[PDB]
Symmetry: none
Subunit: 431 residues, 4 copies
């Protein structure tokens, strides 16, 4: 029943780690304690310089072996307890009680909230790497949950913790449960409680605001490194960690009509789809304002017919327009002379049969506009397939990407025209 206390979540500029360590040492003078950090914390932690208390520095160093930054090599015991800063040991035998709870139960992780201002609460959590998304919500089976929000001591076996790909990546409260929920592991929120530090850290408003800003930066760098572009919550709140109007798009130049994310066995990053939807809405608005006849085309019409949205692995939007109405829209006659950046940041280009509207100068997610003209009662272009004009007389309202778009009438027939029978019900899933 030997447990190593492992401290990872603290701020060098303001912490209660010395009190934390001394509290556990008072219950057992030989208590193994590992404080982990990326670089040597300054001001000095001034931990007891005793063999059972050790500081593990996790970044590479010119004068250290590979083993010196691998944390399992500091942990000899069967069980490990992640303790956040602000916790202290008061009553004895709490770690042993958590161990017997873990062995008695069926959850590979047990947790005991710390009585801070934000004690841990259960949460549900669903990770979809394919969609670059993590969704949180209220946990139906509490005290059994997928993740925790707030402060808690977490206990698990060392073999379980250190076989994870990133066991001590910060913030631990986000990184750990992303990895354990993806593996189908559960955490049991026990009824035990650890007391708070008698002199808690981040006592002033400046200190707390400084810590929250650097914590938000670490959380953003973590999610970007691990492929989470979107955190969403039950209730609707969204947290974005991908591209936007002032950045480049997430994947860059496609070759051979296969974007990079497909080889990573993922679909389109949700931030990229968001920009495409917003550009589709903007362009349609501009076109309808100028009185230009447009209709959904290609995979955009297909996605609209299938589920009213962009096909989740597509990376552009295709609209058809009447060649005759091109002149009615200022952005487009300007696009003939050269690239036009309008007042809202969108970039209209002609390149090439067609026009292309990019989300911004830096973010090259685009809507392609393909002009057709009626010559035979058939709609046709001039460089390269054609379709009869009666599919556009009239056009029908069709939900797409958050707004009501225009589609050819009888568009399921139109889609079997362009793609073959059964296209809507048989999606061509990437493999």
């Amino acid at each position: 029943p030997r447990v190593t206390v492992l401290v990872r979540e603290f701020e060098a500029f303001d912490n209660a780690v010395p009190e934390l360590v001394d509290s556990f040492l008072q219950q057992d003078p030989a208590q193994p304690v590992v404080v982990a950090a990326d670089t040597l914390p300054y001001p000095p932690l001034a931990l007891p310089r005793i063999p059972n208390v050790r500081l593990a520095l996790l970044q590479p160093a010119l004068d250290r072996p590979a083993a010196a930054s691998r944390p399992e090599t500091y942990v000899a015991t069967e069980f490990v307890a992640l303790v956040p800063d602000g916790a202290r040991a008061e009553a004895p035998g709490l770690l042993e009680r958590m161990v017997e709870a873990l062995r008695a139960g069926s959850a590979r992780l047990v947790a005991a909230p710390v009585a801070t201002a934000n004690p841990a609460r259960c949460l549900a959590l669903n990770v979809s790497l394919r969609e670059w998304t993590a969704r949180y919500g209220a946990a139906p089976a509490a005290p059994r949950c997928d993740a925790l929000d707030g402060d808690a001591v977490v206990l698990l076996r060392a073999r379980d913790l250190f076989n994870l790909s990133a066991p001590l990546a910060r913030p631990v409260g986000t990184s750990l449960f992303l990895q354990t929920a993806l593996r189908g592991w559960a955490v049991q929120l026990l009824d035990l409680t650890f007391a708070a530090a008698r002199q808690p850290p981040l006592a002033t408003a400046h200190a707390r605001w400084k810590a929250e800003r650097e914590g938000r930066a670490r959380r953003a760098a973590l999610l970007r490194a691990l492929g989470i572009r979107l955190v969403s919550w039950e209730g609707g709140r969204l947290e974005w960690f991908g591209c936007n109007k002032e950045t480049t798009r997430c994947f860059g130049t496609v070759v051979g009509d296969t974007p990079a994310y497909l080889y990573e066995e993922r679909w389109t990053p949700p931030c990229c789809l968001r920009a495409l939807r917003e550009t589709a809405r903007y362009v349609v608005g501009v076109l309808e304002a100028a009185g230009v006849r447009y209709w959904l085309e290609g995979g955009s019409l297909l996605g609209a017919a299938r589920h009213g949205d962009i096909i989740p692995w597509d990376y552009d939007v295709d609209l058809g327009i009447y060649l005759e109405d091109v002149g009615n829209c200022e952005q487009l006659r300007g696009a003939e002379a050269g690239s036009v950046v309008d007042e809202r940041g969108f970039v209209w280009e002609k390149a090439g049969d067609f026009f292309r509207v990019q989300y911004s100068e830096s973010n090259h997610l685009h809507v392609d506009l393909w002009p057709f003209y009626p010559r035979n009662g058939v709609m046709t272009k001039d460089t390269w397939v054609e379709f009869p004009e009666h599919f556009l007389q009239p056009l029908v309202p069709l939900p797409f990407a958050g707004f009501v778009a225009q589609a050819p009438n009888n568009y399921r027939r139109f889609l079997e025209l362009k793609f073959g029978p059964g296209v809507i019900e048989n999606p061509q899933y990437p493999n």
Copy 2:
């Protein structure tokens, strides 16, 4: 098969790695080959789908075990051959030649240049972590070297490569030899040449420009992460990677009075020393032009007397001045009414705590020269806040080299220093003591 080809230095957007892997397989279909990358290379490498060729993705991922990001997981042979993009295997029996050479020699690394436009050259290298410096130079004992500049296949034992802390940190050409040289290991540049790829990568000026921009960015991040603040060639062609006029100073606020670098078992970043020398020179220039009597004080006078420079673990400069001369200098007169940024960015302030003056390098970089006003009563120099000393030490002042210029010092400064610090202090430096610091705090 005893060697595993490992490819780490290449660019996703333009490379010849397929030709590389193919060239080694054309000589032995069973040859073990590992292409290592942080993320899946795009466009697809389309490497042969055989068991002995593996793509090693070294970044941690939510869906993978810890072992997947450890490069030793992918190598099961005794040696590793680090092959740069642009190389190719043509003459059979070349890796076995490098094995025989390394076995018979005393160097732990052997290398063969590749016949590109930039073939490997032999270099000397010493790494001082205390001084945060990588000193390069021409290799006196060539073809036994400390580092290589250029393209080469480097062969060493897998157990050696993967015991390094950062075995595949990029650029490998920089990261590997910083680690091996610090360990006292040599690389032996053999009389063997690998051919270049028949379609070499980065052939256009544009491709090269993008590769070089990314490569320099990776080098800069690598040196900062590893605590190399200064790179030099033959003591010149200095390359800096630390603080400057526009940044914070490297160590920030001292709580000790023991700056952070002492707990890291190093000395003052050269980076910071340079700013201190710059500021001391500028302040002395200002004091002399304004007619302010100054002299080197405390550890600055001690360092000047010892070796004519700042003590390499100190972090400021101290000067004494006559108090009655303060009025002669506009920055100092302005410093008593509040903080003044002068025309060259230096910040002159009057620390109300100690009744002294402080001149910062810049508004953001708080390396400073301190000015201690003394005034004579009864022929003793004294001040009213806190050692006092007889004025005859200042009558007259003598020249003394310090920090790249000639400074003023008290006469009989060795006596002066001995009365302030004790006898023999010039000869017995209080060298930093990590063990003791670990004990006292």
Copy 3:
């Protein structure tokens, strides 16, 4: 099951500890390993400087806390395995199998021999601190023993090993089992074998020779530090670690008639008793050949009457002689002129107290026989100077006419007739049947 490997038995000048530690690291790269030494070994051990392999220096040091020299603070695991130099991990998971047997069995220690030229064997062991003796013999209930002889990996719980007073005193093979056997613990000798080092230490006869010497010196210092004077084996072989003719006696000058070892709740060291018996045997042989009438006196007679030997907490021997006979013995004649060293190294001298003689084992070892001269006044034996003990009294001469044989200290000695009445006259009724310390007003 987590097991820390702990290495204590090795020589700095010649060892295979690097091979040992690497052999366990090849089975588990994070295997916790503690090498313990008294001082920093030179030449350098050059262990892997990785966090799971640590060097524990048990010396005091000005710049270290108390914890730095307490080995338990280096061991965080439930179990610890003492591994000797010259051993090697080859099979996977032997430590796990040893843990399993310890859990399943009743012994607090389990052991696996090492395939050296001298694998561990199973031994019985009784420790008697009161008698300063460790008695070894063949194991009656093997493979369950009190002690081992030879090289073995010994696995036990850290809480058990580090609760011992001297868990890592060298030689561990002697020190550990002296402590565990005294506590009634057993060591189970398992049917598992660790391999020997591929390049074993002490490869040359010279290197071996200096190693056997410094081990012998360490063992001797260990037994003296722990108060083991005598070690015996099943064949009857004895090794001594105390008194001899060439040294000082073990205990020094006695105040209050109560020697220092009694307050340590120990009896007379077995080496001091041996010297006392060989001195008694010699002195009696000299007096008989010289024609001096002697009889067992005081506590020596009492011990003879009880069990034919020196009282086990006594520290001298007392004999009475007719004073008219002193002139018959050359040593006694010389002793009145001064201290005499005789043909066998014994020292004869007239004492510095009450007109009696004293015979020392040697010049350096002052264990002695005291000779008390008596003369008959009127059928009553008496002296002119008397020490202030209840045992120093006049007595009737008829007790000496005639003397009777009585076994004492391995030989037949002369005793007063009716020695029971003689002893009760000098000590009070029932003295033979009621043993007590020389002075129970201080210690009983």
Copy 4:
């Protein structure tokens, strides 16, 4: 409840006043905790009161005791410990809590009160340098705030501070305690309180004192050797040595891979070894000057001379160059080619294993040495046909240079000479040993 445990460690079993000491403290408070600590059971018996608050702590391994029994903290349940020397007696009541009150209100982690004996404690300064194996004592400039005490004092400090040291009760406590506390930068405050002397003071006769001092001196010498204190000095003088000498082996023995054992221990060269090196250098130089052998400081010896006029503190030998053509002028050198020569003052002169150089050892047992490297002009260059080769004008002429306490000869413009051999800026950038580096590079 009492907050101080009296601890008695400094006493002699054959002659002490410990029973009086214990009784005096129990007479102010019968429940006062008192601990007498000893390595073995003191004989003759102490016969201390058989009450629970009086305990004999035996600090010896024993076959029939648990680990806790030999640990002194086992016996202390109070926050504070008062180390009381034998010869003290408690008379004025409440002296211990005045000392507790002083300690809490002050800023020294130790407070002390002298005992009114023949040798009352006096305040001292103490600098401990493990790197130089030296304890430097002197008068205390900021008394009554000290680093160490000399004499008899009751010393009070927190139990957790005392029992956290490596050797809290090592004898003599008056030496071991302040070596450890001064190294930690702790201070002792000599309070203006005084304890009374025992009514019947111990060691009252000259013979008893002689025995007591002999054993104490023996304990002190063993303590400084075990703790690595080779030299004790008072005001920089009155040197007291505890290392090697002319009749012993050198401290670090045989060197493996030019890395002497002291470097791995994160220290520099022992001061006894440096002293012998300076003696041998001065002697060899004097012999060479009297015999007419031209010599010059070479290598690291010259480097130390130019830098600070002494052996570099982590070097362990001295190197001199000589003209080969002058070897015949020296008797000891002439004999050195034949075989090893012990000269009239015990120094040993040898021609080397190979590499053609001469070696002069301090003595037959102590192998600290000066090396002599013979050169000869071949053109204008100095060479040994088996050290760097350098132009001969650096020797035309030689210059005086302070070194190791005398004046030695050096190559002219030794600064240029040194950078030709070692590299630019060598005099100015010394790099003391790097044990962490050493740990990485064997």
